[PDB]
């Protein structure tokens, strides 16, 4: 490109891989949201928590694609793998799956930041620090808080606890 | 001082000791608040209850220092001891620790009032009656109410009760 | 912690030490503020300058503790040493002490940033760059400006100059 | 009186003496205010500081007379002695005279409070604590602050300092 | 040009030289403004006085370039010489340098007006009378007033005077 400066082919490829990862995560959260809308599951606040995450992760992919074109890189899309499960269990199982997925996104962000640092690409480092790394730490902390609250509610009356969480936290 | 009148060295020293006690209590409540913000504890209303108490106790120290200078006494600061615990247990354990601490502050206020009375210092007596003694009785009553509500919630489903208290009272 | 990722024990400990340093600085500024409120000192703008700094440094400690829990580290509080002086001299002496203290906080921030960089912790580096390093440079520049203005006012009429500074700058 | 209860003849007489003292102080401050309005003195902020104090002390006398009738005591007025000086010197001399006068009022208030306490008259004790003792401590602290600021301004250019104080503090 | 009428090559060249002179003066005032923002100089009102002059002189250059194109002349830019000093001394030294610079701009304006008059170019004469000559006389009078006020403040307490000027005039 006429505009490309200081933007390695390694970073360009890793940004494309990260876009795939974010779109995969959006699709996983779409599947989690619609599972909680099942008439035999029926946890509306859980459905809305995951549907909002699906939108967030799509928006993160769109911001990475915007940056890829601002740097003069070329977006390359790959197939999007289906989510790992078709049914997601309890709200506890689902929130455990969600923190595993967000940990994996965070590790991908950290790996890209490290690549950027090795390539002396400060605009990439800044972009990630500014729009991704703190949002991901904040999200992971929120999920961990949720996770602890769900766990303390299981006790010996798991249905009751699952209802309450949904009603009073989500 | 040019302005000092009717202000004994005994009262001056005891006001400095009370400032230390209030600042110690602010620090204890800061530690309690951040313990309830842990991802493995995650009781937001409990965190906010103690963080608000940390601010109150700091403000009480600042009011005592203001009065010390209005009387012509001299503020003398000492080291502030760390809180008694690093981890605070359950919300019940924490509220028991908080009432023990507020009882000890109240006894210090009563002891200063008695000193004032023995020194015939009515401005000191009035200052304490006006800004401290009723606030402390009101706080201790609120903690005792909380304490009773937490206790009735333990039953055989302690996690559930701890969640509910947090959600519906705090 | 379930949420901890990329957060070294070295950084965790250094954040706890920095919290102690910020709380120590808040306590120093509380002592400076109340010294200028003495009836025999009576520099209201000087008192308000330091009282505002006490609040800032407390808020900096609270932000570090928030981040410590967002990363899955554990807050550990230590005793808070009393300020270095009981009486702080002239406004010049006090502003010299304040710049020495802010230089020492800045060096602690830089040392933590360096640790973060050695540990490849970009979220820590970003957090410090975002909330601490520019605020500290801005503060140190303001104190240096004050310092120069106080110095030019001493001349042969130090009382007059101290009054004027207080009245017309603070 | 039909309404008198728990109100000793000693307290009644001492309240009448305190009314005389407050009215004397109002008259002293009237003389101080008009001295600073002299064309050969011409310190407008000093004049307004003392004129406001004249009004305060008159209002304090009126509140004591109101209380005397609410208790069923009988107001008895005596001659009001002229102020101690006809010309009041510098603003420093005048503020020294004003703090001497306020110290003497405070000692009279404390003496009445002690009498009340010896007579087991809590309504009198409360009335003084509520409307007089803290106002007098606040005033004496303000005068002491002023006093320190005037003193630091004398230096070797006393006229300049007196102008500045008036202009920038009062 | 198709539009050029009554616009001599001598005037065209002198307008280009005047643009250089105005841009040089803008750069001088930028250097003066940032010198007064030094932490070891720290005269904020002095910094703002010169920074505003830097903007004025840039705007004067832009108005001359606008007029050059409205007449069908051709802008020709030359190198811009650095300011005459790197450090500017006291506010007195700086205001003396500023009046020397404004006198030199005024003499350049008068010389161009004279050229215009010799070339019978009334649109040029009007343009200068309308947008430059009275603004320059007003500015030079303001600087001279400042200069007199700074001079009366030096006395035997130059620091004090420099502070006061900055605080109370600028
Ligand atoms: Na939405
Ligand atoms: Na951005
Ligand atoms: Na609050
Ligand atoms: Na009060
Ligand atoms: Na504030
Ligand atoms: Na932030
Ligand atoms: Na009035
Ligand atoms: Na009343
Ligand atoms: Na401007
Ligand atoms: Na025009």
Curated annotation (Swiss-Prot), chains A, B, C, D, E:
Residues annotated as binding Fe cation = 52, 55-56, 59, 62
- GO biological process per UniProt: intracellular iron ion homeostasis; iron ion transport
- Tell me the keywords, alphabetical order: Acetylation, Cytoplasm, Cytoplasmic vesicle, Iron, Iron storage, Lysosome, Metal-binding
Q: Could you tell me which residue ranges the Ferritin-like diiron domain spans?
A: 5-154
Q: What GO CC annotations are associated with the protein?
A: autolysosome; autophagosome; cytoplasm; cytoplasmic vesicle; ferritin complex
Q: Iron among the record's keywords?
A: yes
Task: Give the InterPro entries listed for this entry.
Answer: Ferritin, Ferritin-like, Ferritin-like_diiron, Ferritin-like_SF, Ferritin_CS, Ferritin_DPS_dom
Gene Ontology MF annotations? ferric iron binding; ferrous iron binding; iron ion binding
TM stretches of this protein: none
Q: Which Pfam families match?
A: Ferritin
Where do the record's region annotations for Catalytic site for iron oxidation lie? 52-59
Which residues does UniProt call coiled coil? Answer: none
Main location (coarse class):
cytoplasm
Any idea where this protein resides? Answer: Cytoplasmic vesicle, Autophagosome; Cytoplasm; Autolysosome
Tagged with keyword Transcription regulation: no
User: In which family does this protein belong, per the annotation?
Assistant: Belongs to the ferritin family.
Function of the molecule:
Stores iron in a soluble, non-toxic, readily available form. Important for iron homeostasis. Iron is taken up in the ferrous form and deposited as ferric hydroxides after oxidation. Also plays a role in delivery of iron to cells. Mediates iron uptake in capsule cells of the developing kidney. Delivery to lysosomes by the cargo receptor NCOA4 for autophagic degradation and release or iron.
- Please describe the quaternary structure of this protein: Oligomer of 24 subunits. There are two types of subunits: L (light) chain and H (heavy) chain. The major chain can be light or heavy, depending on the species and tissue type. The functional molecule forms a roughly spherical shell with a diameter of 12 nm and contains a central cavity into which the insoluble mineral iron core is deposited. Interacts with NCOA4.
- Further remark: In horse spleen the light chain is the major chain.
Q: What is the protein's given name?
A: Ferritin light chain
- Origin organism of this chain? Equus caballus
Identify the coding gene: FTL
């Amino acid at each position: 490109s006429q505009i490309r400066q200081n933007y390695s082919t390694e970073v360009e490829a890793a940004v494309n891989r990260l876009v795939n990862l974010y779109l995969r995560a959006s699709y996983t959260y779409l599947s989690l949201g619609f599972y909680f809308d099942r008439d035999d599951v029926a946890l509306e606040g859980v459905c809305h928590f995951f549907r909002e995450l699906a939108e967030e992760k799509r928006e993160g992919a769109e911001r990475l694609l915007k940056m890829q074109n601002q740097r003069g890189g070329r977006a390359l899309f790959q197939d999007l793998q289906k989510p790992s499960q078709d049914e997601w269990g309890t709200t506890l199982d689902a929130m455990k799956a969600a923190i595993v997925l967000e940990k994996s996104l965070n590790q991908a962000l950290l790996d890209l930041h490290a690549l950027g640092s090795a390539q002396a690409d400060p605009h990439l480092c800044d972009f990630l620090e500014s729009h991704f790394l703190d949002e991901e730490v904040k999200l992971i902390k929120k999920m961990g808080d949720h996770l602890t609250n769900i766990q303390r509610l299981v006790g010996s009356q798991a249905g009751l606890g699952e209802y309450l969480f949904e009603r009073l936290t989500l």
